[PDB]
Design a protein around this ligand. Structure first.
Ligand code: NAG
Ligand code: NAG
Lengths: 440, 440
C-alpha cells in the first residue's frame, strides 16, 4: 500500500496523519522533525589573513655601487638609493661622503597568526537537505536522519519512507561566502589572483599551509632619512582588518525565514520555507482487521471551550460506547483543526478528552475516531495574550475567521441585492405581458 | 583596451587572432589548448564488492533444546534444527537418538579483497570545465591552467585573460555513475539501503573503512544433512560478480564527442563540443606605434598551389617591399582560410611564403599583412586521400565548395527565368497600353 502526504518544513512541530484502508483498522502515522539541515556544497577558493611586511636588511656599500636582484617573493620591491651617509651608535658608518649606495628590499608574507586568525572564501552551490525525524507508524517507532532527496529511502519494519525533494530550491547562501571566526558572511570576494590593495583578499593563499601567496598591497619604497639605517615603505593598510572594521551582520542575523547558520559543516538549520513531500510504502501485513481494533458506537462531540490561540487552546469531549478497550486512532481529515495526539486509550463506556488547535471562530470539523466520524461544532473566543513565543500549531484559511454574524450581513446585503433585482425583472416581465395583452 | 573573442574547444589546434588598434601596431594573439578537462562534482554514497557469507560453528545440544540469539549482524539468519544426530570423525557426537538440537546461524560480510576489488558509486553534477593553454600575446608567452568559469582571471605581463563559461553545459556523466577498476559507467544503481539480491549493490557500505554494511542477498538456512555437522545455506549469487559479467563498455568507449574519460579525479578530457569565450584586458603600454613595426607597401598575393585538404594544403607567397626588416603579423579576418602561423620575418624587399588551410575551391581571401592588406585569389584541387588521421583545421561555409561552373549554372537557371518573366510582363503592359490607346 502506497501512501503520500506533504509535511510542512517546521522543526519541533509534529505532523499526525492516518491511513484508512477500505475495510481495515486505521493506521496512525506521526512525523516529528527535530532538525532540518541544508548543507551547500562548498569548495575552498583561498584563505585571507593579516599580512606581515617582512623586509630584508638594507645592504650598504661604501664608495661603490650595487645592483638589484628579484629574488621572486610576493609583492617584492627592491630599490637602491645613492648618496646615503648612514650612522650607527658607534658613529658614522661609512667613510665616503657621497657615492655610497644602500639597497633595500621589502616583501610581504602571511602574519604569524594566520594559522588561527584567517577567513576562508568558499563557493556554494547545489545545497543538499537532511532532516532528523522521529517517525511512528503503527506503534513502530524510529529516530533517524533522512536525506530529503526524493529517492533515498529510510526503511524499518518493512515500511519504506522517501522524503523530499524540498518544494523550494531557496538557499540562504549566495554563490560566494566568506567564513570567519566560525560565522558565515555573504560576501562577494575577489577571485584568486585578482585581489586589490586595501580590501578583502589583498593577499591570498590557496590553503592555510600552501606555499603560494598572491599579494597585491600597493607596496612602494621611500628614500631613507639622511643618517639613518632603515627601510621606509608606504603600502595600503591591511584589507582583512579593513573588512573586519565594517562587514555587516553575519547570516546568523540576516538570513531570511529565521535560518540558524552553523559552521563545520557550513549549514543552515530550521529554515521555515517549503514543505517536504513524504511517500510511505506500508506492506499489507501491518493492516490488521477491524474486529481486532475497538469499534465505536453512539459517540458525540461536545466542545467544552475553544480559544483559537496559536497553541492547543481548544478541548473537546466525546461520549462513546465502544465495543472494547484499547488504543484508538483519532484524526481530523479537514484542515480546520489539528489534534495534539493521534491516539487515545478507550474503554467500553465513557468520555474521551481530546486537545486540538484551530483558527476558526465557529469550528465545524468532522473528527474521526476508531471507525466512526463525529461532527464537532461550537464557538471560539480570542486568546488572552497578544504576543506568544511559539509558532502557529495549525493552518488558517481565508474564510476561517468570518464568524456567523459577518456571514449574516454579507448574505443579507448580497442576497438582498439579488432579491430586489429579481423583483424588478419579475415586475418588468409582468407589465410587458400585460401590455401585450392590452393589444386589442 | 578590452578584446572579446571566441575559441573552438578543440585540443591541439592553435587558434590565432590579430587585434588592431586605431593607429598602433597590430598585436598577435595565439592560444593553444593542449588539454581540456571537464570535472564533475561527485559525492560517494556507497561502495560494493563481493560478499562473504560468514557463519558460526553449529551449537549442538544432546537431549536438549536451544533458543535463537537476536540478530545483530548484516543479513543474519538463525534457526534451531531439532532431531539432529551429528556424527563427528570420532563416531557419533551425541548418545541421544532424538531431541538433539543444532543452532546454525549465518550472516554476510565484505570479502577480504574489498580494499582493492570494489566499485564505488558516485552522484555527479555541476561539471567544472578546465583548460591547459599556451597563451602568446605580443611575444609574451605563458603556459597555464585556466578555469573556464567566466570570472577567474589569469595575469601575465599586466594582461588579464578570462575564459568561459563554456557555450554548452553538456556532460558525458549521468546523475549516477560507478567507478570500477579505473573505468566509469553510467549506471543507475539503487540508493543506499535499497539494494536487491543478485544485483549490483546487494551489499552496501558507506565507505571502504566504514563499519556499517547493508546486506540483502536472500540468505536462507536449510536443514543439515543427516549425520553431518555443517551449516547449509542458500542465497542469491553475488550481484557484484553478475554486474561485472554484463556491464557494457565504460564511458571510455561510448562517450559522445570523442571524450576521454579519466579517473582520479573523475573527469572527461578533450571533448570536441562547445566554444570557449575569451576576454583579454591588454594594458595600453603593449600597443606600439606603426612607425616602430616595419610598415609595408606595394605587395600582392599569388597562390602557388592550393589543395583543400584538412591539413595546411595551400601555399602562397606575397611579394613585399617593406620599409625595414623585422617581425610582421599575418592573419585572415574571414573564415575561408586559416593560416599556419601568425608571424613572419620581412626583409627590405623580397617574397614571403605563407601556408594556409582552406575549404573552398576558389579562395578569394582577404589576407592582412601587419600594415598592408592583400587580396589573394586562385584555384584549388581536391585532396588525394579519402581518410586522414587529422581533424579539420579549417571552418567550412555552406557555399564554400560551390565552384564556378555551378555558379554559372545557377545564375543561368535562376535569373534567365526572371528575365523571361520580365519580358512577359513588359509585353503584357505594352499590349495593354496599345489596346487602351485604340479606344479611338
Ligand atoms: C522523538 O525523538 C526525539 C529525540 O529522541 C525527541 O526529542 C522527541 O520528543 C520524540 N518525539 C516523539 C513524538 O516521541
Ligand atoms: C604548447 O605547450 C606544450 C607544452 O609545453 C608544447 O609542447 C607546445 O609546443 C606549445 N605550443 C606552442 C605553440 O607554444
Amino acid at each position: 500500500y502506497e501512501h503520500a502526504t506533504t509535511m510542512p518544513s517546521q522543526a519541533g512541530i509534529s505532523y499526525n496523519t492516518i491511513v484508512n484502508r477500505a475495510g481495515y483498522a486505521p493506521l496512525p502515522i506521526s512525523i516529528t522533525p527535530t532538525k532540518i539541515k541544508l548543507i551547500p556544497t562548498v569548495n575552498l577558493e583561498y584563505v585571507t589573513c593579516h599580512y606581515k611586511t617582512g623586509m630584508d636588511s638594507p645592504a650598504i656599500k661604501c664608495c661603490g655601487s650595487q645592483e638589484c636582484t628579484p629574488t621572486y617573493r610576493p609583492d617584492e620591491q627592491c630599490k637602491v638609493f645613492t648618496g646615503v651617509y648612514p650612522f650607527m651608535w658607534g658613529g658614522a658608518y661609512c667613510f665616503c661622503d657621497t657615492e655610497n649606495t644602500q639597497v633595500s628590499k621589502a616583501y610581504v608574507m602571511k602574519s604569524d597568526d594566520c594559522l588561527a586568525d584567517h577567513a576562508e572564501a568558499y563557493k556554494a552551490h547545489t545545497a543538499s537537505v537532511q532532516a532528523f525525524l522521529n517517525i511512528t507508524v503503527g506503534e513502530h517507532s524510529i529516530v533517524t536522519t533522512v536525506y530529503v532527496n526524493g529517492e533515498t529511502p529510510v526503511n524499518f519494519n518493512g515500511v519504506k519512507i522517501t522524503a523530499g525533494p524540498l518544494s523550494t530550491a531557496w538557499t540562504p547562501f549566495d554563490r560566494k561566502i566568506v567564513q570567519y571566526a566560525g560565522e558565515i558572511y555573504n560576501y562577494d570576494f575577489p577571485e584568486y589572483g585578482a585581489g586589490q590593495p586595501g580590501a578583502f583578499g589583498d593577499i591570498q593563499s590557496r590553503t592555510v599551509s600552501s606555499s603560494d601567496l598572491y599579494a597585491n598591497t600597493n607596496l612602494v619604497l621611500q628614500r631613507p632619512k639622511a643618517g639613518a639605517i632603515h627601510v621606509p615603505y608606504t603600502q595600503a593598510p591591511s584589507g582583512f582588518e579593513q573588512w573586519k572594521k565594517d562587514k555587516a551582520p553575519s547570516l546568523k542575523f540576516t538570513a531570511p525565514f529565521g535560518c540558524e547558520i552553523y559552521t563545520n559543516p557550513i549549514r543552515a538549520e530550521n529554515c521555515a520555507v517549503g514543505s517536504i513531500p513524504l511517500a510511505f510504502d506500508i506492506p499489507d501485513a501491518l493492516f490488521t482487521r477491524v474486529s481486532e481494533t475497538p469499534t465505536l458506537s453512539a459517540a458525540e462531540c461536545t466542545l467544552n471551550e475553544c480559544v483559537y490561540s496559536s497553541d492547543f487552546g481548544g478541548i473537546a469531549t466525546v461520549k462513546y460506547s465502544a465495543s472494547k478497550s484499547g488504543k484508538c486512532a483519532v484524526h481530523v481529515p479537514s484542515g480546520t483543526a489539528t489534534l495534539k495526539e493521534a491516539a487515545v486509550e478507550l474503554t467500553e463506556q465513557g468520555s474521551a478528552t481530546i486537545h486540538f488547535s484551530t483558527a476558526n471562530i465557529h469550528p465545524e470539523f468532522r473528527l474521526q475516531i476508531c471507525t466512526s466520524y463525529v461532527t464537532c461544532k461550537g464557538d471560539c473566543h480570542p486568546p488572552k495574550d497578544h504576543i506568544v513565543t511559539h509558532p502557529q500549531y495549525h493552518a488558517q484559511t481565508f474564510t476561517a475567521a468570518v464568524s456567523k454574524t459577518a456571514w449574516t450581513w454579507l448574505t443579507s446585503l448580497l442576497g438582498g441585492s439579488a432579491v430586489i433585482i429579481i423583483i424588478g425583472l419579475v415586475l418588468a416581465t409582468i407589465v410587458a405581458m400585460y401590455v401585450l395583452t392590452n393589444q386589442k
